Scaffold this motif. Structure first.
Motif, mmCIF file in Angstrom:
data_model
loop_
_atom_site.group_PDB
_atom_site.id
_atom_site.type_symbol
_atom_site.label_atom_id
_atom_site.label_comp_id
_atom_site.label_asym_id
_atom_site.label_seq_id
_atom_site.Cartn_x
_atom_site.Cartn_y
_atom_site.Cartn_z
ATOM 1 N N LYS A 126 -27.878 -14.792 -72.895
ATOM 2 C CA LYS A 126 -28.699 -14.956 -71.695
ATOM 3 C C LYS A 126 -28.177 -14.054 -70.577
ATOM 4 O O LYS A 126 -26.966 -13.990 -70.356
ATOM 5 N N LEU A 127 -29.076 -13.355 -69.870
ATOM 6 C CA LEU A 127 -28.725 -12.677 -68.619
ATOM 7 C C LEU A 127 -29.747 -12.962 -67.515
ATOM 8 O O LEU A 127 -30.953 -12.827 -67.739
ATOM 9 N N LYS A 128 -29.263 -13.349 -66.324
ATOM 10 C CA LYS A 128 -30.049 -13.439 -65.086
ATOM 11 C C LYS A 128 -29.414 -12.713 -63.898
ATOM 12 O O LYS A 128 -28.223 -12.897 -63.632
ATOM 13 N N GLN A 129 -30.196 -11.885 -63.185
ATOM 14 C CA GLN A 129 -29.678 -11.001 -62.133
ATOM 15 C C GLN A 129 -30.683 -10.975 -60.983
ATOM 16 O O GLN A 129 -31.864 -10.695 -61.202
ATOM 17 N N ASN A 130 -30.211 -11.261 -59.765
ATOM 18 C CA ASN A 130 -31.013 -11.191 -58.542
ATOM 19 C C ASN A 130 -30.358 -10.276 -57.513
ATOM 20 O O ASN A 130 -29.185 -10.458 -57.177
ATOM 21 N N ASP A 131 -31.119 -9.292 -57.022
ATOM 22 C CA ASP A 131 -30.706 -8.398 -55.942
ATOM 23 C C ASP A 131 -31.671 -8.503 -54.763
ATOM 24 O O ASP A 131 -32.887 -8.378 -54.940
ATOM 25 N N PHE A 132 -31.124 -8.732 -53.563
ATOM 26 C CA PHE A 132 -31.891 -8.899 -52.330
ATOM 27 C C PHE A 132 -31.324 -7.988 -51.242
ATOM 28 O O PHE A 132 -30.104 -7.915 -51.071
#
Lengths: 47, 43
Positions: free
Chosen positions: A25-31
């Protein structure tokens, strides 16, 4: 008829299991946020 | 953007002027992709 005959041996059953699981599993958030202002005022006394 | 410029003078005579400027711009963009794939072979 092959190459050999069985001089002796055992008889029965073979049971084998291979069982494999592979989860990734991979989850990535950039803001990113940018806020800019200018203000200017000129006057004398009338302008 | 907001800009103001006005003149008001006495002299007899009197003259006044006012100019008003307002401007707004807005932009938004949204894009979404979802892909879901299943392979199931049994024999």
């Amino acid at each position: 008829y092959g190459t050999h005959y069985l001089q002796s041996g055992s008889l029965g059953g073979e049971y084998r299991v291979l069982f494999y699981v592979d989860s990734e599993k991979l989850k990535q958030n950039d803001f990113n946020s940018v806020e800019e202002k200018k203000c200017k005022s000129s006057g004398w006394h009338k302008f | 953007m907001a800009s103001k410029s006005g003149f008001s003078f006495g002299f007899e005579l009197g003259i006044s002027s006012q100019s008003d400027r307002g401007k707004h711009y807005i932009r938004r963009t949204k894009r979404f992709s979802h892909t879901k794939s299943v392979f199931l072979h049994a024999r």
